[PDB]
Amino acid sequence: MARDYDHLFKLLIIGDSGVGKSSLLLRFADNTFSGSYITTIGVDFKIRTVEINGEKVKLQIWDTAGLERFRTITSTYYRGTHGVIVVYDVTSAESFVNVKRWLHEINQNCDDVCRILVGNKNDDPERKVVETEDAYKFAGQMGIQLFETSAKENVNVEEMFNCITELVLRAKKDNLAK
Template structure:
């Protein structure tokens, strides 16, 4: 019997950050809906999707927020750092500028996110022929930041699931759901919040 998205043990709020055009929406679409839209319209403000995954035997509900990368929306996205336990920081392997801007995004994260937030760096569009930022550069930067790095492709799906699995496992292993807060990230105790059997509920 298939379990619903309301049946979970933990809920983690994640953000996908990066410049406009690096493929944030396509990454989210590939992970949640297992599809790819090459002509996806740029995100205006904020959008999010939900997916429940299994991590170390626990059902984890991921609430993944896709943010607009344009400069004029960065002030809007600042408010969405609150309660975020994990961040996917993305650049485009075919865009040197988006890679150079990673450190600017890191500064934003340090300024607005919780100091314990889990962070992973990904170089998207790694399947393209016109790559200008080789994976070695991404790995070097990730080492400097003390975080993990994944070359990804929203088109082929390469490493997309692995990124979110890795982030969720890090949050769970380090118990960041307890450290960062218990409001946005709730520990649900095995159906205790569900209606009890034999209770008369109209519905």
């Protein structure tokens, strides 16, 4: 409806290099996908506005470097962040086992933040090594929701960003009451 946003949130995407962090954002924001791999240097970002239950919500989405030598100062990633998207690759056992260190990094840097866990590259059943039921059970233990996605074929990407946007919106309404 072209009005001024009702809410502004900052979302942060973190997780291992190669896991598809940029690809998730690029598909959500520009509806594009490329087989090309350009490693993210420091931070990139995208600004999009979504409609959620009649409310206009502006999202400032930060896409971080997976490679430690291209990571800029962690404090700067995290300042002012409302929601963190933690991404692993369902095809990489190693990307999954590092999820706990990313969760710990969130705790190191944030007091009160919404989180969501994303298993990307769910495109190739033959090479899937992180089974839904194990990831789901782990998500449950950490009190976060799980989304398995494919940036490649655009499956569950919108749903995922919608979820974390809803979480962040509900945390905001809840803090106002208290």
